[PDB]
Design an enzyme around this catalytic site. Structure first.
Site, PDB file in Angstrom:
ATOM      1  N   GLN B 173       0.829  -1.184   0.000  1.00  0.00           N
ATOM      2  CA  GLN B 173       0.000   0.000   0.000  1.00  0.00           C
ATOM      3  C   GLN B 173       0.872   1.246   0.000  1.00  0.00           C
ATOM      4  OE1 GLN B 173      -3.556   2.049   2.521  1.00  0.00           O
ATOM      5  NE2 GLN B 173      -2.646   0.185   3.326  1.00  0.00           N
ATOM      6  N   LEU B 354      -5.743  -3.143 -11.440  1.00  0.00           N
ATOM      7  CA  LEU B 354      -5.108  -4.381 -11.038  1.00  0.00           C
ATOM      8  C   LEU B 354      -4.490  -4.368  -9.634  1.00  0.00           C
ATOM      9  CD1 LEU B 354      -2.674  -6.072 -13.546  1.00  0.00           C
ATOM     10  CD2 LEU B 354      -2.014  -5.709 -11.183  1.00  0.00           C
ATOM     11  N   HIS B 358      -7.214  -4.880  -2.264  1.00  0.00           N
ATOM     12  CA  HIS B 358      -7.925  -4.696  -1.003  1.00  0.00           C
ATOM     13  C   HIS B 358      -8.262  -5.975  -0.204  1.00  0.00           C
ATOM     14  CE1 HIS B 358      -8.156  -0.671  -2.843  1.00  0.00           C
ATOM     15  NE2 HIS B 358      -7.988  -0.247  -1.605  1.00  0.00           N
ATOM     16  N   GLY B 496       0.240  -8.085 -14.519  1.00  0.00           N
ATOM     17  CA  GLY B 496       0.894  -7.215 -13.565  1.00  0.00           C
ATOM     18  C   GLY B 496       2.403  -7.223 -13.638  1.00  0.00           C
ATOM     19  N   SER B 500       4.961  -4.073 -13.777  1.00  0.00           N
ATOM     20  CA  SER B 500       5.852  -4.016 -12.616  1.00  0.00           C
ATOM     21  C   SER B 500       7.335  -3.967 -12.879  1.00  0.00           C
ATOM     22  CB  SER B 500       5.576  -5.181 -11.663  1.00  0.00           C
ATOM     23  OG  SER B 500       4.949  -4.730 -10.467  1.00  0.00           O
TER      24      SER B 500
END
Ligand code: HEM
Ligand code: HEM
Ligand SMILES: *[C@@H]1O[C@H](CO)[C@@H](O[C@@H]2O[C@H](CO)[C@@H](O)[C@H](O)[C@H]2NC(C)=O)[C@H](O)[C@H]1NC(C)=O
Ligand SMILES: *[C@@H]1O[C@H](CO)[C@@H](O[C@@H]2O[C@H](CO)[C@@H](O)[C@H](O)[C@H]2NC(C)=O)[C@H](O)[C@H]1NC(C)=O
Ligand SMILES: *[C@@H]1O[C@H](CO)[C@@H](O[C@@H]2O[C@H](CO)[C@@H](O)[C@H](O)[C@H]2NC(C)=O)[C@H](O)[C@H]1NC(C)=O
Ligand SMILES: *[C@@H]1O[C@H](CO)[C@@H](O[C@@H]2O[C@H](CO)[C@@H](O)[C@H](O)[C@H]2NC(C)=O)[C@H](O)[C@H]1NC(C)=O
Ligand SMILES: *[C@@H]1O[C@H](CO)[C@@H](O[C@@H]2O[C@H](CO)[C@@H](O)[C@H](O)[C@H]2NC(C)=O)[C@H](O)[C@H]1NC(C)=O
Ligand SMILES: *[C@@H]1O[C@H](CO)[C@@H](O[C@@H]2O[C@H](CO)[C@@H](O)[C@H](O)[C@H]2NC(C)=O)[C@H](O)[C@H]1NC(C)=O
Ligand SMILES: CCCCCCCCO[C@@H]1O[C@H](CO)[C@@H](O)[C@H](O)[C@H]1O
Ligand SMILES: CCCCCCCCO[C@@H]1O[C@H](CO)[C@@H](O)[C@H](O)[C@H]1O
Ligand SMILES: CCCCCCCCO[C@@H]1O[C@H](CO)[C@@H](O)[C@H](O)[C@H]1O
Ligand SMILES: CCCCCCCCO[C@@H]1O[C@H](CO)[C@@H](O)[C@H](O)[C@H]1O
Ligand SMILES: CCCCCCCCO[C@@H]1O[C@H](CO)[C@@H](O)[C@H](O)[C@H]1O
Ligand SMILES: C[C@H](C(=O)O)c1ccc(-c2ccccc2)c(F)c1
Ligand SMILES: C[C@H](C(=O)O)c1ccc(-c2ccccc2)c(F)c1
Lengths: 552, 553
Positions: B173, B354, B358, B496, B500
């Site tokens: 996060q 993506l 959560h 992803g 990334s």
């Protein structure tokens, strides 16, 4: 203790890091040299350098044997060499960019704050004995004096290459899209955040200004008809900020991308040709894509002219200036196999170097009429009076002056050169000899070796004290020209890397963008692929005048 | 009257659909390795390459099996060879320079230059298409809220089988909130994180002024405060920077940090504290080495060192945990010095969707014998100073985080975010999940069951969407079946990873131009980067060293 880095200890691009209170260290990482000062070459570095023919030798071969070159220009070898010129030249310019007026070290802020001009060599440490580091007098030559003694035009020296005003103004127009020093921020700061060929000198250096100049119909740019001819809109119709003398009303000013373009018919001539050109291409596209809206028409039109611009610059502009027999070529694909970063950042050294003011003549002959600076400068009516064709033919026939050589800057604009020298000192640019080395050349050993003569050399010597104290700009302009050339060795060896990188480093040159769809189809794609100075002018003028970068 | 031919997504293999005339279209298959009208005819080499490529699932298997074999390889040069392969192969999937944005579904100078826009890999679904997703599905898409309570709402907490904990959940996060920072004032598709990558702006500020506000302006240090003899971010009184704290909270109780939003959670402010500690610490290491240096150069060089520290820990520990691979990932910018790679990055909107992980968040937050609820956790301006860094790090390091992929695992307290994500996806008019599947080298799902791996949910999803080819991007990602014992499924990785790896290796410090010891102030700063580790990050900055890991003990 004298800052050890004032001695410029680290050779071959090695970085001088200061340690302790009195030590220093050279970061020779990937320089091809080892040792405390990055001076012991690797076996491969040693061959490459010891086998490299001088700049002068190469220049010779490139400007001789027309017959040989003719064959070459007709084989695959033309591409082979073009690719070599492109890669070799570019490796000299760092990417991502390194230092700026504020940081003589790599930093995220330098990397990200695009308001700064970048620089190839860090400044002369503020804590050095003399202004240029270790050598020279404690005080540098009066900029003005230096300017009147060696730069002031005594008698006009025309350029032997046959360059004319059509080219001189093209260079001024062109370069003023990426050189746009922020007056409010000071030297080292630029308003031309595109840092390259974004054609912001046509569309505006900011979105708002662009919207102001936009017609918002068919992707077209605003404009006006005068004498049945198309000209940039008025500052009344397109309320954009322009720099016109006090007292000139909006209705009397033409609104264009670059605020400053109103101060010369030559500039506004080119602004008119390209405005004409944008709207023309807007029509070609609309025909092809009736479904397209304004934005996409506008956006695709702009990418097409960016490509047109980059082509004409490499194949005609640079072709003229280099005077090579090798036929230069614009093919983004020659780089698709190379390790090349499609990114560019305007360096302050490049801005100094491109102060080609000696190109400007003593007066401006437009047919039987001969206009003075006082009649030419600020003249808000000469363009509409004569029209595009009339001025293009005129500038295309009048020769421009030599750049290198010395004492060839007309007295009317000699102040600019004075300012350039003073700014160089604010920016604390390193000595001319340091940049010589930095760009792969051997430093001058005497003022005479530089000038190629004895009169000026001797006075320069008594002024500077040491050749190793000769400043960047003066050194460039006072250095001896290649035979029958417009300038000397340094202007090419230093300017080319900056130049080629800025043209090929444009995102449209990347494989990602170099696709016919990027331009709206084969149509837009070929417009780019076949761009030519004559077509640029002539497809946009009732008649087609003598149009060239070479005087007839 | 004529349906936009590009609504059929005619052009395969990345070919561009250009509309011509009033009713025609053309596919730009330039360099797609495919020819033909729809970019469908492969070249002999393209044919081989594709027909010889083992599935994502097969690869995933080999990478998570045969430890003893991975142990040997990891010790040969074969580790670098593969690491370089992963890096290049993965990255080629992400375009550079960037292409489209919320405003232009075509390349344009404005897209290339206006950095306020999030970029996108696939242009939107033409506004003139029959259905919302182009040609298939129902004329109206499933109620976002409904879709969220039936398939995304957590019934029972499903922990991540990979052993991921809250230390990692909060790290993700914190980390991601430096490049994902959607402009509320400008709307979706607009970002305030103009760095578009690991610029550490969530520590230093997303703008110069803010940075100056947080700067101590002495020894390159960042401002801070002592509480209980421990160092914590300064007060908004001391460093008057805008923070998002509910109205009614004294400024005296607001900590000023780079990211305005980091005050909403002890987990975030915990990490802001560790890094502030870390910046000042490195500032001291440099000052010792370079007494001649000023504040700016100390500051500037300190920031480059932590950027490197960040990129190392992310690749070797964070991504190592998340992938669960046996291959020992490695951060060596040099493996790319021979490749054709552009050191440039631009945050894609698809990447933002993506990364809405959560479901990681638990039902409550256990800090020792104490167990805190969301109402006691969120916005708790005192838990961090109360417990201190060590206490919270050990806590989060021990409590497991929930599974991401699979369905029905988002705690009701934050289920609203997922609802919003789905609604935003529709504003941005993202293409169908199956299109992105193909775009990222995967075969599209043929049934809702093939996707979920079951029949119950699958059948209901089907009567809701109507066509699998109408399944939306985000729901598809979260509802897709997980790899065995994995935290998520095939798509999250295949989609992803490119985003990334490109964003980590595309940082300018990874370029040969910057990857020099001098860039970091000497060997000292250079090794700080080269040897960065999560434990060191925490422990060299805390009175004691707690259980610190991304894996639950
Ligand atoms: C009628 C002829 C011209 C006039 C009146 C003129 C005048 C000026 C002046 C006044 C400056 C402003 C800054 C200062 O005072 O130092 C300047 C800067 C400059 N000029 Fe010219 N110039 C002319 C032609 C050219 C030409 C032919 C070129 C060559 C391409 C050129 C290149 C430049 C460059 C690159 C700068 C710096 C731009 C910047 O930093 O924003 N100029 N010129
Ligand atoms: C205590 C747990 C958390 C809470 C209270 C929470 C809450 C939120 C909220 C309210 C939004 C704002 C926009 C909206 O309402 O749609 C949001 C967006 C987001 N969250 Fe979280 N979140 C939490 C944990 C996480 C975690 C663990 C991650 C995963 C790394 C994450 C990733 C994101 C991303 C990438 C966005 C979009 C950011 C942007 O566009 O600016 N969140 N979150
Ligand atoms: C590396 O360069 C230095 C500086 O040019 C040379 O050593 C001396 O360094 C001191 C302090 O920096 C200067 O005051 C002197 O001018 C330098 N003396 C000389 C004779 O150059 C040094 O010789 C070089 N080292 C090597 C191994 O080449
Ligand atoms: C880019 O760098 C310049 C130079 O630091 C920034 O301008 C300074 O900004 C500070 C803080 O706002 C002001 O106190 C100074 O007055 C500014 N100096 C100048 C010379 O204007 C500029 O804000 C930076 N731009 C960005 C986008 O970061
Ligand atoms: C601006 O340029 C115009 C020419 O385009 C100048 O007017 C001309 O001046 C010459 C004198 O050298 C006359 O022979 C022409 O007949 C004039 N033509 C016109 C149409 O006026 C005008 O004087 C210039 N403005 C300034 C301030 O010098
Ligand atoms: C290329 O793809 C198209 C669309 O998937 C195929 O058929 C098109 O169908 C759409 C929708 O019915 C129509 O708009 C077009 O008129 C059809 N194609 C064309 C070319 O007009 C098409 O058959 C495919 N072509 C190939 C060679 O596979
Ligand atoms: C980047 O693009 C955005 C979107 O167009 C620009 O914001 C718009 O700017 C225009 C002209 O100033 C305004 O009329 C709109 O209100 C703005 N829209 C939004 C959504 O804010 C923004 O100015 C651009 N930024 C730059 C630096 O070019
Ligand atoms: C913020 O967190 C603190 C703990 O750091 C909460 O205080 C604890 O609350 C638990 C249960 O409510 C008590 O059993 C402890 O005795 C408290 N510990 C301390 C050190 O006070 C506090 O309640 C939280 N604030 C809010 C508004 O929920
Ligand atoms: C075939 C093997 C050839 C090796 C040639 C190595 C010559 C290196 O010449 C180098 O020149 C520099 C300037 O004089 C010195 O500083 C180095 O010490 C010197 O080794
Ligand atoms: C021909 C007479 C001189 C031969 C010298 C050959 C030395 C081999 O050069 C090698 O280059 C490598 C980098 O390229 C270095 O890392 C090695 O240490 C060096 O030995
Ligand atoms: C005849 C040789 C032409 C060489 C062109 C490349 C210029 C390299 O220039 C450094
Ligand atoms: C490279 C592949 C190794 C696969 C090992 C599978 C058997 C061990 O599976 C555990
Ligand atoms: C075991 C084979 C691993 C190959 C490197 C991973 C590249 C994945 O790329 C999909
Ligand atoms: C192609 C050629 C080369 O690299 O030799 C070349 C390229 C660019 C320049 C050039 C130099 C200074 C300003 C503008 C252009 C130049 F003088 C020569
Ligand atoms: C190294 C590995 C790979 O490319 O396989 C890899 C890399 C990155 C991710 C990853 C995926 C989504 C968000 C954050 C990280 C991932 F899941 C796997």
């Amino acid at each position: 203790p004298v800052n050890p880095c004032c001695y410029y200890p680290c050779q071959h691009q090695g970085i001088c890091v200061r340690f302790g209170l009195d030590r220093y260290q050279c970061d020779c990482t990937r320089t091809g040299y080892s040792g405390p000062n990055c001076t012991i070459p690797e076996i491969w570095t040693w061959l490459r350098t010891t086998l490299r023919p001088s700049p002068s030798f190469i220049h010779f071969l490139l400007t001789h044997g027309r017959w040989l070159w003719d064959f070459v220009n007709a084989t695959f070898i033309r591409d082979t060499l073009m690719r070599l010129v492109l890669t070799v030249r570019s490796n000299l310019i760092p990417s991502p960019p390194t230092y700026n007026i504020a940081h003589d070290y790599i930093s995220w802020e330098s990397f990200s704050n695009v308001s700064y001009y970048t620089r190839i060599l860090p400044s002369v440490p503020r804590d050095c004995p003399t202004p240029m580091g270790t050598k020279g007098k404690k005080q540098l030559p009066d900029a003005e004096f230096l300017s009147r003694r060696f730069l002031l035009r005594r008698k006009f020296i025309p350029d032997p290459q046959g360059t004319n005003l059509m080219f001189a103004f093209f260079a001024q127009h062109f370069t003023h899209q990426f050189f746009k020093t922020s007056g409010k921020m000071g030297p080292g700061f630029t308003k031309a955040l595109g840092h390259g060929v974004d054609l912001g000198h046509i569309y505006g250096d900011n979105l708002e200004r662009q919207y102001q100049l936009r017609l918002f119909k068919d992707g077209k740019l605003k404009y006006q008809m005068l004498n049945g001819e198309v000209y940039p809109p008025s500052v009344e119709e397109a309320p954009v900020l322009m720099h016109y003398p006090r007292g000139i009303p909006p209705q009397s000013q033409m609104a264009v991308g670059q605020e400053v373009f109103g101060l010369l018919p030559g500039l506004m001539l080119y602004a008119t040709i390209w405005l004409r050109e944008h709207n023309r291409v807007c029509d070609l596209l609309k025909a092809e894509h009736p479904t397209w809206g304004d934005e996409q028409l506008f956006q695709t039109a702009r990418l097409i002219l960016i490509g047109e611009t980059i082509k004409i610059v490499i194949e005609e502009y640079v072709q003229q200036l280099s005077g090579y027999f090798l036929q230069l070529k614009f093919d983004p694909e020659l780089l698709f196999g190379a390790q090349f970063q499609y990114r560019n950042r305007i360096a302050m050294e490049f801005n100094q170097l491109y102060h080609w003011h000696p190109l400007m003549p003593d007066s401006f002959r437009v047919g039987p009429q001969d206009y003075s600076y006082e009649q030419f400068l600020f003249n808000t009516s000469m363009l509409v009076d004569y029209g595009v064709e009339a001025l293009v033919d005129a500038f295309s026939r009048q020769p421009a002056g030599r750049i290198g050589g010395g004492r060839n800057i007309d007295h009317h604009i000699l102040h600019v050169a004075v300012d350039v020298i003073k700014e160089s000192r604010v920016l604390r640019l390193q000595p001319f000899n340091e940049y010589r080395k930095r760009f792969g050349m051997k430093p001058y050993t005497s003022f005479q070796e530089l000038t190629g003569e004895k009169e000026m050399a001797a006075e320069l010597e008594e002024l500077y004290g040491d050749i190793d104290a000769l400043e960047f700009y003066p050194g460039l302009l006072l250095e001896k020209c290649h035979p029958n050339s417009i300038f000397g060795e340094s202007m090419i060896e230093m300017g080319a890397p900056f130049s080629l990188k800025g043209l090929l480093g444009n995102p449209i040159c990347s494989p990602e963008y170099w696709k016919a769809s990027t331009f709206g189809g084969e149509v837009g794609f070929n417009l780019v692929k076949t761009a030519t100075l004559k077509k640029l002018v002539c497809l946009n003028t009732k008649t087609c005048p003598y149009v060239s970068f070479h005087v007839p």
